[PDB]
Amino acid sequence: PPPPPPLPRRPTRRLKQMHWEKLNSGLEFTFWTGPSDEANKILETLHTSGVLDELDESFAMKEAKTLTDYMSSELQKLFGIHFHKLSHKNPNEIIRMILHCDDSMNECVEFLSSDKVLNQPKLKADLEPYRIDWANGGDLVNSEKDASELSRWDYLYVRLIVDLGGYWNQRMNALKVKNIIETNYENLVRQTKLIGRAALELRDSKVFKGLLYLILYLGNYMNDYVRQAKGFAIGSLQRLPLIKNANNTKSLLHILDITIRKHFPQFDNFSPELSTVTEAAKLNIEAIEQECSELIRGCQNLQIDCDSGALSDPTVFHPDDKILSVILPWLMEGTKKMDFLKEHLRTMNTTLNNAMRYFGEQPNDPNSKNLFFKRVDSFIIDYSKARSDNLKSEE
């Protein structure tokens, strides 16, 4: 590398500063360089005119009126954002209501549940001497370590994160699972009922069976003798729009609409008859199954925690900590919810499966398990546009 360069008349009172952009580069070619006597007489005129004196009186500025935190600079920003509702309350007041697991801070508890607040090794060492050994004795680890010297948010972090960190992650788990279950069990039962009903309706629909037989019988007519199969999969229904006649005006499915209407009045309109399939095509089977399966894993993980985990020990619990007094009442009812959902989960799986073999496809292919109603729905809309175009053109 090349050698490096060195390292880095007047008014009686201060008045308003008028800033400017200066001259571009220098006054190499500007008229400012020219010291015309026209400008010289201006300087003597102003020194004689009573203008500068008035300037001191009128444009004097109004003076200026300008007016041990271990916690990281970024983090004070985050704490004030979420606990804004409690600004008027002292740290002793806000440290108490949070342990009540009240409804008023079901949102703020999620913020302290983030990895950002927990993953702060340097502060945990700094606030460690200020921690109170609440697990045994309930006394300060060091001698004096006054907590009044700490700032407003410093008191909260040491008394909540450092002090209760032994069961903090366990307690938040009991509360994070608390919120998710309270709102999803109602909808999850609705989703699994629709899929099971849709699968049963498709399996128990003669209209859907009848059109497939008509397509198969028509399909075997134009096909060769060596390829006269007696069955086909649902995914093969997409070849109909891809076949065009001599002038490309009318596709294969377009003949079917007028053929059915003229001779098969029973198959004229099957979309109103089978509607739950279309709504079932807007839901992901694997995603729904995984979402429900997540609930059971959290529930069984909770049972070993409340009965034999960190929650089991009450000695490390503060007397004003009703977390044990709130989870246990739900513990019996929560077991009922997981049993019902488990039954519904099994109900959907078998109800989808018996209708799954019934049409020749298998769930072993993950796409086939997911994209089962989509292919049927794809044919439903394809038949809909084919009928609409056929009616519009002829009428």
Partner 1 sequence: AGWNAYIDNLMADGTCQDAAIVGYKDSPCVWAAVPGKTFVNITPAEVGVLVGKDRSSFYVNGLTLGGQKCMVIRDSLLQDGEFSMDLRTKSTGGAPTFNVTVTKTDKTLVLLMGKEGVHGGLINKKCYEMASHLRRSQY
Partner 2 sequence: AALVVDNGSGMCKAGFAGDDAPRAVFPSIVGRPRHQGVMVGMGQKDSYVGDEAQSKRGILTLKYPIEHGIVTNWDDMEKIWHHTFYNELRVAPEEHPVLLTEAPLNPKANREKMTQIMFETFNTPAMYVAIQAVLSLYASGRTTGIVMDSGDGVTHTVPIYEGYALPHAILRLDLAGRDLTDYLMKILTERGYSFTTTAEREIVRDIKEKLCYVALDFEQEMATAASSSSLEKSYELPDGQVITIGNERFRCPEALFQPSFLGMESAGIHETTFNSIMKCDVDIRKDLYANTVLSGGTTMYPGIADRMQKEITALAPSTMKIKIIAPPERKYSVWIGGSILASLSTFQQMWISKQEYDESGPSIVHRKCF
Piece of 123-131, 139-147, 250-258, 378-386 that binds a second copy (CB under 8 A): 250-258
Piece of 27-35, 77-85, 176-184, 321-329 that binds partner 2 (CB under 8 A): 77-85
| Both structure tokens of 367 | 């796409």
**How far is the C-alpha of 27 from the C-alpha of 4, rounded, in Å?**
32
**How far is the C-alpha of 150 from the C-alpha of 71, rounded, in Å?**
10
The interface mask with a second copy, positions 213-232, x = CB under 8 A, is xx--xxx-xxxxx-x-xxxx
Considering only residues 233, 287, 328, 381, which one is a binding residue for a second copy as defined by CB under 8 A? 233
- State the minimum distance, in angstroms, from the CB of residue 76 to partner 2: 5
> Is residue 18 classed as helix, strand or coil in its secondary structure?
coil
Considering only residues 44, 57, 74, 139, which one is a binding residue for partner 1 as defined by CB under 8 A? 74
**How far is the C-alpha of 171 from the C-alpha of 331, rounded, in Å?**
15
- For tokens 């198959």, name the residue: 267
Piece of 53-61, 279-287, 338-346, 356-364 that binds a second copy (CB under 8 A): 53-61
- State the minimum distance, in angstroms, from the CB of residue 13 to partner 2: 14
Choose among 257, 227, 252: nearest CA to 237. Answer: 252
- Identity of the residue, 65 or 190, whose beta carbon is nearer to partner 2 in the bound complex: 65
Contacts of 306 (CB under 8 A, 6+ apart): 174, 312, 324, 327, 328, 331
Burial degree of 50 (CB within 10 A; 0-12, 13-18, 19+): exposed
Contacts of 43-49 with CB under 8 Å at 24 or more apart are 47/9
Residue 85: contacted member of a second copy, partner 2, partner 1, none (CB under 5 to 8 Å, by partner type): partner 2
Q: In which element (H, E) is residue 140 found? A: strand 139-140
Contacts of 50 (CB under 8 A, 6+ apart): none
Binding site for partner 2 (CB under 8 A): 16-17, 19, 61-62, 64-67, 73-74, 76-77, 80-82, 84-85, 87, 107, 111, 151, 153, 224, 239, 242-244, 248, 284
Binding site for a second copy (CB under 8 A): 9-11, 15-24, 27, 30-32, 36, 38-39, 42-43, 46, 51-52, 54-55, 58-60, 62, 209-210, 213-214, 217-219, 221-225, 227, 229-233, 235-236, 239-240, 243, 245-246, 250, 252, 255
Binding site for partner 1 (CB under 8 A): 1-8, 72-75, 115, 119
